[PDB]
Structure formats: C-alpha cells, structure tokens
Amino acid sequence: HHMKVGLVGWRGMVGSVLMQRMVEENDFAHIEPFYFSTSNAGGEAPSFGGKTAPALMEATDITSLKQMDVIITCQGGDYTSEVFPKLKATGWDGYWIDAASTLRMTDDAIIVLDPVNLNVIKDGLAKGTKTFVGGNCTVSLMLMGVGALFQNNLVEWMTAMTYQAASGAGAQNMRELLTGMGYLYNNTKTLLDDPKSAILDIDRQVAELQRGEGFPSANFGVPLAGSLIPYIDKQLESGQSKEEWKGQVETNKILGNSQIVPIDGHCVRIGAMRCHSQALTIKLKKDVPLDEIEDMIRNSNQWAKVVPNTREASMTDLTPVAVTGTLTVPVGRLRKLNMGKEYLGAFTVGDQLLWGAAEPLRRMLRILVEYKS
Amino acid sequence: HHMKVGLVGWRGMVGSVLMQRMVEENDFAHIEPFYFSTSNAGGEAPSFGGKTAPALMEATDITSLKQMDVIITCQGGDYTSEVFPKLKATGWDGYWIDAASTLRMTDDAIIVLDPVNLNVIKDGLAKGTKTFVGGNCTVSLMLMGVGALFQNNLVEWMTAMTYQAASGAGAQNMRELLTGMGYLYNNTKTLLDDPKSAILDIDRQVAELQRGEGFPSANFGVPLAGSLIPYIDKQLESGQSKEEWKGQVETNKILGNSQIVPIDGHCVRIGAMRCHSQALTIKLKKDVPLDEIEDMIRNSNQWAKVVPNTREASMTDLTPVAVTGTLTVPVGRLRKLNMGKEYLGAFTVGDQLLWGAAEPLRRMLRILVEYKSS
C-alpha cells in the first residue's frame, strides 16, 4: 500500500526546493501524491515524478485534507495555525510534516534532523507521534556541522554569531537584495568608470543612495545591500530576538536533551542569497584534542566537511559561494582559543533552503514511507 | 610658534580622510605643514587650511624628513619599514605618528586611542616617547564602544566575531565590491524584471555568476559581493589570522594592562563599504547590572552611544548605514546571555576610516601640539 500524501505549499520557494529534491531522489515512486492549492483550487495539478494527480484541491478544505494519510506543508505558520487545530479536531489520525515553526515546541511534535536525531524520530514513530516539524534553519545547519560535539555531551555552552542570508526571509527579500546591489552600482558607475575618481566621492554617493528614499527597502525595512541588520524576527521581552531564542530551545529538543545546554548569541542578516554562516564560541567540558574534534565532525555524517584552518582553504571552501545550492556543510577555522584549551572556535556555512528547510522534510517523508511499509 | 609637520601619504585613502578632518577641525592653524610625495616630488603642494607649502618633497629622502619636528604618515607599512630605521639612525629626535602596524608592538612606541588611553599617551610624552601609532581598526572601534568595561577591569575574556568592511583592505577593494554588486544585478535583471520569474532560476544564475571567470575578484581573490570571506590578512603559525591576533596584543597594549585579558575570535570580511561591526561575547568578572553596564558605555566618551535593545532601534541605528562616515560608535543588543549573569552579549558598529584609521592620528597631533606649547 502507498500512502496518500497531500502536498501543500509546494509552489512557494521552500516547497519548490522540496519538489526538485523529491524528483531528483525518486521520492514519488512509492507514494500517491495529491496537490493542494490556496489560489488555484480546481486547476491542473503537477505530475512530478511521472505520477499524475487529480485537479488541485483546496488547501484549507478540512474534508479534503482529512482524506490524506500524510500532509507535508511548506505553506507557513498562518496556514498551520488555522488548519491544523481544525483538521485534528475531526479525529484525523494521519501524519503532519511541516516546515513552519508553529508546532515545533508542542508536546506532541518532534523536530526532525535525521542525520542527528534519527533515533528520536524512529522512537516517536513507534510510540504514535504524528507531527514532525523541521527545525529553524540556523539550528539545523549548526547541528549538521558540529552536532557530534553535542551528541557526545562535550559542550558546556555555545555562543553563535550568525551571518544569515536573505532566503530565510523569503523570495521577495532575495530579489530586493539583488535589486539594491544594482541600485548602488548603477547609480555610482559614472564615478567607478573613471579609475582616478575619488574613493571618498564614490563612498559619499553610496551612503547617500542607501539613506535616500529611492533605495528599495520595502521587504527588509532598511537597506541590506552594502549593510547588515542585527535583528531577525520578533522582539521578545528579554531583548532576545525570536531567531536567537530558537537556538537554545530547538537545539536541545532536536538532541533530545532533558537538561538544557545553554545556547545564545546575535542573529544578523547579511547580503547573501541563500547560505547562512555561523561563528561559534564553543565551551567544552574538558580538553579534547583538536584532531579528535575534527575526526568527530568528519565521522558524524557524510555532509559535514572539515575545511583545513588555512588562509587558502578558508577563502575558497568556507564561504556562501562554495556552498550555495549544495548539501555540503563545511566547518572550518577550528582552533583552541586564547582563553583556554576548553574553548573551541569554529566557523560553519550551510545552505538555508536545503538542510535548513526542505531536505529534513523529504528525508522525514522517506523515513515514514519505510516505517509504514 | 608652530612645529614643522611633515605629511606623508596624505593623498591615499586614509590620508585623504585625515586631510579632510584636519581641514574641518582647523588643525593647520597651529602647525607649519610640509607635504611629501613618493611619485610627484617637485610638484605643487596643497594649501589645505589656507597654509602654503613649498614644492612637494621626496618622502623617502632622509635629508628632507629630518628637517621636520613631526612626521605623520598614512603611507603604509612598506614605507615605514624602509624609512623609519634610516631616519632614527641619524639621531633625528622628532615625533613619528603612523597609521601603519609596523611599529605598534615595538617597545618604544605607544598605540594611540586617546578617548580610551589619554593617560598612557600623556605619560609617554613626559617620559620621552617619540613614536605614536594608530591601532588596528577592529580593536580601536571595539574600545571606542565597550572600552569602559576594560578600563574598569571588569572583563575576564572576550570573543569577537567581526563583520569587516572593504575599506580595511583598501580603495580598490571597495571599488571591486561595488563592481561585483553591479555584475550580479546587471546579469540577472532580465529575470528580475519579470515579477513571476522563478526565484530558483534567479538564484542559480547568481551562483553561476559568482563562480564564473567573469566575476571581478582580482583584489579579494574570491567573490565578496553576495558572500563573505572568513579570513583576513596572513595565516599565522597558531592558526589565527594576523587580523585576529591583533585583537589581544593591541587591546592590552592600548589599555596598558600588565595582566593580559584574553581576546580571540574570527575576523570575517562582508560586503560593506567602510563600517566594521563586531558581535561580542564578553565574560565579566562579576555580575554587573545591565543598567550600570549601559551607563558605563554611555558615559565613557561622547561618541559611544547605547542603542536600546529593540527591533526598531537596532534596525535603524545599529548598522553600517546609520554609522558610515560619522564618528558615532553605537553599541547595542546589550543583554545577559543564557549561560549566566556574568556573560554579556554586545553588538557594535564603527566607521573604519575615522576612529579606525585617521581620527586617532589627527587627535594625537593636537595632543602633541598642545603638549609642546606646554
């Protein structure tokens, strides 16, 4: 028997990465797919993987959703907040796989990152857990790189200073970043085209352009091109942003920690398209040799990569350009810090749309397919 | 009476900021300026501040330099390494004020950041110190913002994860950053001009552009626009970069600490023009109340500012856009971290060409002028 799988939000950015990866990995072979829509119900459905589906169904129609064995949704938090309580109220006993943060910290949900917590997932499947949620992008990308140190109970605490890409905010935010890049160059190029133009005149013009009404900043609120924004997501009473708050709660939940390992830091937006980078101060519980730390990372999963701590390798392999659109999670600059041999510095880069969004969801669907067979 | 002041490297980027600031602050009224040149000796000199000067002198000519009471040089490390030992070998007893890192850690030099270490400077002047050097941009900007915590001996250690601008690498690097921004947009705009074009198509095209031979990366060596580079300056035997190593040695030398406060972290280049930003994990020796920490920062000097830890204020005041080309040094996101009340998080932004380069040098010149008139 093939499970009836309802796909929701498959047309948006994260859902589109999910569809591309599912096709690449032959994921449609053993499911019966049904496509849902919020603006095009009744229209022609895709036939991804060569599997035809009936006309698009209404994503908010509880009676249609209830006919599915699994719902995998990339539609987002407003959708889950509206639809999930009503679907569950019917007695529907199917599986819900969600990209959105809504359900992450609910008692009945597991946050999925199976290269790190396959055991947690499989235990939950057997115990009757029905709701599985992707983690926040920054947490998942960090654990894909240095999660082995946590799994071995080596970490006393960690601070994470992030360099987050525009894709985490959305497709319109990525387009705005690029448009702003063009705005700065195209309105300065008459100066740049003269090799002897004054750099201070060029610089004055960039600043005027960034501060002016013409700069396109509708989505981020303030300029990102040529700048950074040291605040991501909602303001909490403590002064932490919600993005920073996710670090401690989601990391410890993915790991299944009952006792919290403290995680904190600043989450900062920079002008990259879709790779998040993180600069980590990791306080270890004991003096672990650096070469053993490196081997733990290498052996943790096939996507983590240790980048030698050299100028050349760091510049070519430990950047958004090296990583973007790939499943590789490099970890570099690995070094014991000046305040003691128990202090480990690390710098890691990962693709936000893959391990940070779509990839845990398709792998969870595969785990469920194999479990149900 | 006016000291004869030789200006070297005044035409370069840092020296141009110095010259503009000196004009704005009427710094030429108190000196007799002489202009030196490495490629235009004999040419007409500027008359900044309305002071005329003789024809440009040769910056490497020891006979001309030794006529000066003060040399202030923005020319750079290769120049200082060549000329400084030759000039001091003559017995020249003048003052040397230098932007370059060359002399920073020599016994006889003082690193100048007078809003933080005026006492170290005035002490050295009275002891006979003649060589005063600007500190690395990262350290100076950090101390302008949170130096009060170190001056009050509250800091047990600190890690600094930096977001450094192109200007620290040079004018050509800034131009390359902007040119790469244009390269990415102008070669993707046929897609961007369609509101329904596929974001993954746009993304694929940006990555191809960044990875292709057409991408302008001669100066940084790899792309910076749309990226970052987690390595700045030379690789040291310890695995630090030289940029990261400057953190601990320069901070403790500016402050005059006998007991070294550990400072470490990663220095990362991002696509900004001339403002460095730094995300700090500060381990305090005791639980200092957050409001007292903020007051220490606010009251430290007139350029440090505490940005309220709110989404709106952080987005508008704690960014390169808010700070660029100004002397303001905002410090924000100030909060005790989850691992304990002794752990303080902070995020600060500073202009690299002003407090990070030219401003300490012109202020040092003013200190010297005032000191030599008693």
XYZ file of C-alpha atoms in Angstrom, chain B residues 3 69-70 95-97 125 132 363-373:
19
model
C 56.123 72.768 14.811
C 59.608 68.236 14.091
C 56.807 65.724 13.443
C 57.873 62.681 16.638
C 56.604 59.902 14.356
C 52.821 59.444 14.085
C 55.119 62.134 26.189
C 52.845 57.029 18.333
C 43.837 63.902 17.651
C 47.341 62.717 18.574
C 48.790 65.584 16.547
C 46.620 68.012 18.536
C 47.772 66.421 21.794
C 51.386 66.865 20.698
C 50.829 70.480 19.600
C 49.245 71.342 22.949
C 51.973 69.463 24.817
C 54.866 71.215 23.033
C 53.316 74.623 23.791
